Amino acid sequence: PLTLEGIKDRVLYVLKLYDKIDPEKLSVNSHFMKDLGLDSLDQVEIIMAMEDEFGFEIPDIDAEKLMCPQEIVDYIADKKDV
Amino acid sequence: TSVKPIFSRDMNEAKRRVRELYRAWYREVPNTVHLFQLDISVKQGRDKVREMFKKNAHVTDPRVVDLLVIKGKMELEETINVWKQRTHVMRFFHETEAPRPKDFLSKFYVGHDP
Amino acid sequence: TYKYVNLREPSMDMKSVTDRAAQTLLWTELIRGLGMTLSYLFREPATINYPFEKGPLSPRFRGEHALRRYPSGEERCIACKLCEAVCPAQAITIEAEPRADGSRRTTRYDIDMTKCIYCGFCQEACPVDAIVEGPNFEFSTETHEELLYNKEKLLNNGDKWEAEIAANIQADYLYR
Amino acid sequence: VRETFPEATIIKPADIFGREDRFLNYFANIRWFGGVPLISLGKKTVKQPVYIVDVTKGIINAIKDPDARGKTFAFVGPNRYLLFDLVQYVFAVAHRPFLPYPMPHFAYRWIGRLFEISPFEPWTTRDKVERIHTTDRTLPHLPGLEDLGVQATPLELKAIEVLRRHRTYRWLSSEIEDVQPAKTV
Amino acid sequence: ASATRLIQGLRNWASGRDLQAKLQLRYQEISKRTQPPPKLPVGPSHRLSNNYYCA
Amino acid sequence: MNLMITLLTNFTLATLLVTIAFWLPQLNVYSEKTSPYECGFDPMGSARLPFSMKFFLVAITFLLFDLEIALLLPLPWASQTTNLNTMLTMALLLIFLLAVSLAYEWTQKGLEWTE
Amino acid sequence: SRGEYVVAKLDDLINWARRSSLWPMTFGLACCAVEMMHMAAPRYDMDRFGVVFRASPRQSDVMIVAGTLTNKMAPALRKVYDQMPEPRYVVSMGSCANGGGYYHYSYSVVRGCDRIVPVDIYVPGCPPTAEALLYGILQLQKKIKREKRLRIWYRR
Amino acid sequence: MFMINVLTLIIPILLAVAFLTLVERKVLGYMQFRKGPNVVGPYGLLQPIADAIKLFIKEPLRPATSSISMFILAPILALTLALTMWIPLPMPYPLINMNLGVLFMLAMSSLAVYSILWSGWASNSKYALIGALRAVAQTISYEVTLAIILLSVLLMNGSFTLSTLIITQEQVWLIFPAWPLAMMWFISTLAETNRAPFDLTEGESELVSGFNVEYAAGPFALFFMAEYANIIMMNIFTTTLFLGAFHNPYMPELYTINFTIKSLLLSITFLWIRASYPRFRYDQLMHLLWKNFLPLTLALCMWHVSLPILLSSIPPQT
Amino acid sequence: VKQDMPPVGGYGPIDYKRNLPRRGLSGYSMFAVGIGALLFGYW
Numbered sequence A: 001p002l003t004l005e006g007i008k009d010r011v012l013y014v015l016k017l018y019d020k021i022d023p024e025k026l027s028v029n030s031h032f033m034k035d036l037g038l039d040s041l042d043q044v045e046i047i048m049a050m051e052d053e054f055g056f057e058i059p060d061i062d063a064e065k066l067m068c069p070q071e072i073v074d075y076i077a078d079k080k081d082v
Numbered sequence B: 001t002s003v004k005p006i007f008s009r010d011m012n013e014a015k016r017r018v019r020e021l022y023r024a025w026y027r028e029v030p031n032t033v034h035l036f037q038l039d040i041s042v043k044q045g046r047d048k049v050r051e052m053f054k055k056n057a058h059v060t061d062p063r064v065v066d067l068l069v070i071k072g073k074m075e076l077e078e079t080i081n082v083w084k085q086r087t088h089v090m091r092f093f094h095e096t097e098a099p100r101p102k103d104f105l106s107k108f109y110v111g112h113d114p
Numbered sequence C: 001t002y003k004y005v006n007l008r009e010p011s012m013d014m015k016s017v018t019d020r021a022a023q024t025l026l027w028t029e030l031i032r033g034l035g036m037t038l039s040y041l042f043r044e045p046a047t048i049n050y051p052f053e054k055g056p057l058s059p060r061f062r063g064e065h066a067l068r069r070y071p072s073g074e075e076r077c078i079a080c081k082l083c084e085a086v087c088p089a090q091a092i093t094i095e096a097e098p099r100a101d102g103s104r105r106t107t108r109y110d111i112d113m114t115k116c117i118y119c120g121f122c123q124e125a126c127p128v129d130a131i132v133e134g135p136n137f138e139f140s141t142e143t144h145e146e147l148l149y150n151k152e153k154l155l156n157n158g159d160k161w162e163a164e165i166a167a168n169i170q171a172d173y174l175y176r
Numbered sequence D: 001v002r003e004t005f006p007e008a009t010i011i012k013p014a015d016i017f018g019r020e021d022r023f024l025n026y027f028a029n030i031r032w033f034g035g036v037p038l039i040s041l042g043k044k045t046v047k048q049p050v051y052i053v054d055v056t057k058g059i060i061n062a063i064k065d066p067d068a069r070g071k072t073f074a075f076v077g078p079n080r081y082l083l084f085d086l087v088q089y090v091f092a093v094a095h096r097p098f099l100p101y102p103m104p105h106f107a108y109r110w111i112g113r114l115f116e117i118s119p120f121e122p123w124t125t126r127d128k129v130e131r132i133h134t135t136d137r138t139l140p141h142l143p144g145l146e147d148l149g150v151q152a153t154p155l156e157l158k159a160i161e162v163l164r165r166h167r168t169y170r171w172l173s174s175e176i177e178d179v180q181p182a183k184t185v
Numbered sequence E: 001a002s003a004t005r006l007i008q009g010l011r012n013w014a015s016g017r018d019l020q021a022k023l024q025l026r027y028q029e030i031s032k033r034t035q036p037p038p039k040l041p042v043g044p045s046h047r048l049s050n051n052y053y054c055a
Numbered sequence F: 001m002n003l004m005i006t007l008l009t010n011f012t013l014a015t016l017l018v019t020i021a022f023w024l025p026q027l028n029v030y031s032e033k034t035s036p037y038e039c040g041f042d043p044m045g046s047a048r049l050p051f052s053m054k055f056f057l058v059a060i061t062f063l064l065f066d067l068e069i070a071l072l073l074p075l076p077w078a079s080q081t082t083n084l085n086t087m088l089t090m091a092l093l094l095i096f097l098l099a100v101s102l103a104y105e106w107t108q109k110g111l112e113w114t115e
Numbered sequence G: 001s002r003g004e005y006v007v008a009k010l011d012d013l014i015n016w017a018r019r020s021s022l023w024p025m026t027f028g029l030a031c032c033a034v035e036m037m038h039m040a041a042p043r044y045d046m047d048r049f050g051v052v053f054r055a056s057p058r059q060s061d062v063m064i065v066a067g068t069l070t071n072k073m074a075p076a077l078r079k080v081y082d083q084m085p086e087p088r089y090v091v092s093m094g095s096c097a098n099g100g101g102y103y104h105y106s107y108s109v110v111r112g113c114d115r116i117v118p119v120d121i122y123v124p125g126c127p128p129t130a131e132a133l134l135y136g137i138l139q140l141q142k143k144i145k146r147e148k149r150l151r152i153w154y155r156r
Numbered sequence H: 001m002f003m004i005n006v007l008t009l010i011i012p013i014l015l016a017v018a019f020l021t022l023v024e025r026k027v028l029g030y031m032q033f034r035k036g037p038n039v040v041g042p043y044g045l046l047q048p049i050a051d052a053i054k055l056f057i058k059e060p061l062r063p064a065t066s067s068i069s070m071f072i073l074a075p076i077l078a079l080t081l082a083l084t085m086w087i088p089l090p091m092p093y094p095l096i097n098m099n100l101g102v103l104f105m106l107a108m109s110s111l112a113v114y115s116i117l118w119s120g121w122a123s124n125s126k127y128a129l130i131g132a133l134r135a136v137a138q139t140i141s142y143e144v145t146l147a148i149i150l151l152s153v154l155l156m157n158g159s160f161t162l163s164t165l166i167i168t169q170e171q172v173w174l175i176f177p178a179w180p181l182a183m184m185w186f187i188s189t190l191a192e193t194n195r196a197p198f199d200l201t202e203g204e205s206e207l208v209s210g211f212n213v214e215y216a217a218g219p220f221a222l223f224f225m226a227e228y229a230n231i232i233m234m235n236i237f238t239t240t241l242f243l244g245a246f247h248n249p250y251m252p253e254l255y256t257i258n259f260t261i262k263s264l265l266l267s268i269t270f271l272w273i274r275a276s277y278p279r280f281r282y283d284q285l286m287h288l289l290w291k292n293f294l295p296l297t298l299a300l301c302m303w304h305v306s307l308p309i310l311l312s313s314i315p316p317q318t
Numbered sequence I: 001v002k003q004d005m006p007p008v009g010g011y012g013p014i015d016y017k018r019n020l021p022r023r024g025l026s027g028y029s030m031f032a033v034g035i036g037a038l039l040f041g042y043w
């Protein structure tokens, strides 16, 4: 929560704890629907894993447009100081 | 073709409501396993919730998925409040039923149903 | 054409105030209730000594079903299925065919006593007084399938209880 | 039975567990007596316990199979466990204090004759001592549950269902996943 | 109705009402269990003339 | 000495009526017969949750009025003294102070229950 | 043998004490419970037989399923029956508790309480009279009278 | 030969409890226009033996959520304190002649509440919790007059000795100078002993069984026989307080027969009140013993302190 | 004809009102009895 690097490493840590994503393909600019091949509900439980990690209620309109871990770490950086 | 909505103007608000309902079920399942003292894992109940959501995944009518969100919130209120019992929650897990014959050959062997 | 229950104002002279204060401090209506209960203590109770004494019944009473016969040995049921057409619970199942002398009789006459609602539409729909709902009510079983009567059980109920069913129909049949 | 009915299906269960068993309930109920005594710390015997609905589906699929006539089936669970960590997993699901201790073979049969002098159903016997401390033999030549189409259920799915009864209220509502599984061999 | 007049008087005093005049246990004052056979009347359409059903 | 024997006897054949109550019949224990009773359906939450006392001010003032019968209780003995008008004045002072306390607890609606 | 005589007389003692101290539970469902109250009424009077209600299942001996068992209450019926200590018995009163009854083909009715609990005495009627219910209770007492618990323990 | 005296005390006052169950059911039946038990024995005289054998051959059912130690200790302490409140009662001679037997009765009344109370807590159930805290609400209501009434009646006795209370009432009954105290003590003992109209702990209609709703047979027997031992002891105690009989030092059986039939009449009076009244709401219980009985009890305490001084009739303490 | 019918003069008059017969003493009599019992006990 202090620097952006810890946030990005923690995002990738939660996404490799997530089991339906194969971590070998998991890059920071990897997409979930067309690259990793996920359902929408997979991305929804990814966002709820992010709320289990970071601890702030993410609305629906700005979590729909979180289609890569880079967008996730950029949105957490927008909602924080860094 | 000019019909009156229930909650959703189109499929975007409808998918928003389906998404919020799946969020609420995903948050609810560990409490449902705990205080009903169900003998299933939390992943197993979450996969049952994913199966019950993917069962209705072919609907393209906003009014029908509005009613599905409505009935899902009703079942969620029956699950948060202890109004269901262990039987009503485990009825989504068809466990006493036999695996029905799937191919043509075993359905031919057991009976007359197509 | 209407009356006001509980619209009494109490009297406020010193006599009635002292009377209610004695009722409050000395518990008069409580002693009234104790007196009425003590009055029932010294009565004869209404307890009939079952199974030696029986509750009173009428000749209209609707109990166990029975298939009746004519006074020659011939059974009365001529397979016309009005009793299962009017049965409000579909307890009666009838299957029939002409028997060996060409007579219209039943091969199956089943009454499910655990669907039966004991309303007696079958005994009032029967044109020949074959099915009746007789006087027996003490026929509790220890297993469920003993309360699924076939034709043989119903004819044995008729042969068992005929000396009473004939008399009850003789007592009531002018009202029917 | 094989010589007087040659077409009989003779079934070998290993050690059946369920709600009404005398296997996991037995392992539970030595928190009453003491500190669950075991021959040679219960680490020289191996068990592979089978679930009861697996055995029941095996019996019914042996009824429906004409190829099960004259066979000899061996119904075992999927995982083999030593007796030590089997009992440790039993006492870990029930959240009881597990403090085992070695009792020798000549003295743990005197405890066996101490409880079979009752005229009722005995709490234990020397035969049960011999059979808790008999290893489940491996017979690969006999067909099993996989040859009747019965998928064998492991202990880590049904042990909570068996052993929720032996818990006290302070840990009565803990879940199936809130325990480390036993070590297989 | 078989009670002694001591118990009868105590019971009347305790209830405050006259109880032998209005007994709740029934005796020979009730109707007979065997009755004469009735002759029930018929309705207004049990006629042989001017009885067209459409009218 | 006799009191200890009598209490030991009462406790003994009150606990020998329990040890022949648990060990004599036949048990069929399963984890639904020992479930909590909530009139047939499963209980919502625990019965160890806070059960809010409505009568709490009366519950506190019972602790201040129960001391009075540790104070008013020597009055059968205090009547046996040789300074008796002083004793009578102090006794009526104690019951009067209890009564003034009860009057004050009435008039501020302290004997009523909350909600 | 002497021991067979002793266990026979002790069977007679425990069967006497269980059939002459039946405590049913305050549990009705439908119209049959009105008639079951009439079996408690001063004419038929269950209490002369030792038959008296206890509201808790822990302190009840028989469950008279008096009325219609629907689907919404069948788990409540099963948990109430489970919370009765052994020996516990079930008397099924009326047609809906026996076999579904007048609501047999309904979407919402359990077709007989014997799909849910083991049933000892089936009392037939819609409703059975309070005298017929008391007949079923006395037949249950006769069923308890011929139990052979300690004899079968002595022989096994 | 004192242990034989303890046994001949406490075994007949278990048989009296047993046949009080039959007397309760039959007097309750004839007051309800029905009969009580008459089938099991000759006119029901063997019904309590069937009930006593039945409850100890039925499965005991210790619950899953129950804190088991207090769950077992509650009926043990119930029947222990029910038996041991009979020992200072003069019959005309008490088992243990205490100089302060009244305070023993009062303190062992105060300890008997914890049987109900720990039974309601230990059996981890919601109705049992309601039945336990309704016992709290009932005990804080009756204890705030149970000691002042019993104080004001002994200001004519001189001590807390129950055996002296026979000598106190040798001329007149002590209900004649103290009938407001008597009619208030009687209701305070109804509310003490959890009998109707003050049931309120084993509430059949509000609760299911209240505190003993989880107690199956065997442990349930030791609350029920405890409650009936409490009511027989409490009517014997009320009889000793207000209806003390003639005592001949050479013929004790005359006094024994006399207080026996008086306490039996008060037991029938308890059964006859339980057969006739609706049940209080358990706050109206508290607004009775605090707002109605307690002011008048303080007034009668002033009067019964001042009146032996007023007439030079202070009783001796010896 | 024969039919279940009321008699020719009809049935008798039927009571249907409240009869709570107002028994007991008055207030002053019961307080006089109570105070007299108090005075006898005190003497």
Ligand SMILES: CCCCCCCCCCCCCCCCCC(=O)OC[C@H](COP(=O)([O-])OCC[N+](C)(C)C)OC(=O)CCCCCCCCCCCCCCCCC
Binding pocket: C024, C025, C026, C027, C030, C031, H180, H182, H183, H184, H185, H186, H187, H197, H238, H242, H273, H288, H291, H292, H293, H296, I034
């Ligand atoms: C022990 C031997 C037997 C003793 C007698 C008892 C047996 C009869 C029992 C009958 C059944 C009772 C069952 C429980 C009933 C519970 C209800 C109940 O009783 O409520 C109490 C009721 C309550 O009344 P309430 O509830 O209607 O009060 C309404 C209160 N407000 C207005 C605030 C809402 O009465 C009392 O509290 C009175 C207590 C006893 C009074 C005794 C007074 C004696 C006279 C003193 C002197 C008077 C003159 C003044 C001085 C003159 C000087 C010269």
Ligand SMILES: CCCCCCCCCCCCCCCCCC(=O)OC[C@H](COP(=O)(O)OCCN)OC(=O)CCCCCCCCCCCCCCCCC
Binding pocket: F096, F099, F100, F102, F103, F106, F107, H294, H295, H296, H298, H299
């Ligand atoms: C000096 C003598 C000794 C006095 C001290 C010893 C007292 C012994 C008794 C102990 C009493 C303790 C509790 C007393 C509480 C009194 C206050 C009270 O309750 O006031 C409220 C009451 C009206 O009640 P309310 O407010 O409507 O309550 C609603 C819920 N019921 O208000 C009322 O009902 C009005 C109360 C005042 C008027 C009473 C008049 C009685 C007169 C009797 C004759 C004279 C006696 C001598 C004393 C002087 C009295 C003025």
Ligand SMILES: CCCCCCCCCCCCCCCCCC(=O)OC[C@H](COP(=O)(O)OCCN)OC(=O)CCCCCCCCCCCCCCCCC
Binding pocket: H015, H041, H042, H045, H046
């Ligand atoms: C302080 C006083 C306290 C008093 C406590 C007791 C009060 C009640 C006293 C007893 C009252 C009568 C009891 C009657 C019992 C049954 C009698 C009877 O008829 O039993 C018959 C039964 C079956 O026999 P069967 O062969 O069927 O008979 C066919 C007949 N041609 O055969 C049997 O039942 C077998 C025989 C059993 C006998 C049991 C008798 C009762 C025992 C009660 C215990 C207490 C006894 C007293 C102890 C203290 C005094 C000494």
Ligand SMILES: CCCCCCCCCCCCCCCCCC(=O)OC[C@H](COP(=O)(O)OCCN)OC(=O)CCCCCCCCCCCCCCCCC
Binding pocket: F001, F003, F004, F007, F011, H073, H077, H080, H096, H097, H098, H099, H100, H101, H104
């Ligand atoms: C964990 C939960 C609890 C589980 C275990 C429960 C055990 C039973 C609990 C209930 C009994 C508690 C007893 C408490 C002490 C009572 C003392 C007593 O009875 O005193 C009254 C009486 C006064 O008479 P007095 O004026 O002394 O006359 C003789 C002089 N002429 O005194 C006499 O007559 C004197 C006779 C000798 C007295 C000896 C001293 C008292 C012995 C106390 C034993 C232990 C008490 C334990 C209390 C546990 C409370 C829960």
Ligand SMILES: CCCCCCCCCCC1=C(C)C(=O)C(OC)=C(OC)C1=O
Binding pocket: G025, G026, G027, G028, G029, G030, G033, G034, G036, G037, G040, G053
């Ligand atoms: C104590 C007197 C006998 C009571 C017996 C009650 C047994 C259970 C019957 C169920 C029932 C209850 C409780 C009941 O209160 C009631 O209301 C009148 C009913 O009818 C709708 C019932 O069916």
Ligand SMILES: CCCCCCCCCCC1=C(C)C(=O)C(OC)=C(OC)C1=O
Binding pocket: G052, G053, G054, H014, H015, H017, H018, H020, H021, H022, H024, H025, H048, H051, H052, H221, H224, H225
């Ligand atoms: C040796 C001691 C024997 C004690 C027997 C206890 C069991 C008897 C309970 C009978 C009973 C009584 C007296 C009773 O008071 C009652 O209330 C009406 C009942 O029904 C709810 C009863 O079942």
Ligand code: SF4
Binding pocket: C083, C086, C087, C088, C089, C090, C091, C092, C111, C115, C116, C117, C118, C119, C120, C121, C122, C123, C133
């Ligand atoms: S009595 Fe009614 S329900 Fe029964 S068989 Fe006859 S018609 Fe059918």
Ligand code: SF4
Binding pocket: C076, C077, C078, C079, C080, C081, C082, C083, C084, C094, C125, C126, C127, C128, C129, C130, C131
């Ligand atoms: S109505 Fe009568 S004759 Fe006709 S089928 Fe039924 S029983 Fe037979």
Ligand code: SF4
Binding pocket: G030, G031, G032, G033, G066, G067, G068, G093, G094, G095, G096, G097, G101, G102, G125, G126, G127, G128
């Ligand atoms: S069997 Fe019939 S009368 Fe009886 S409760 Fe059911 S519906 Fe009512």
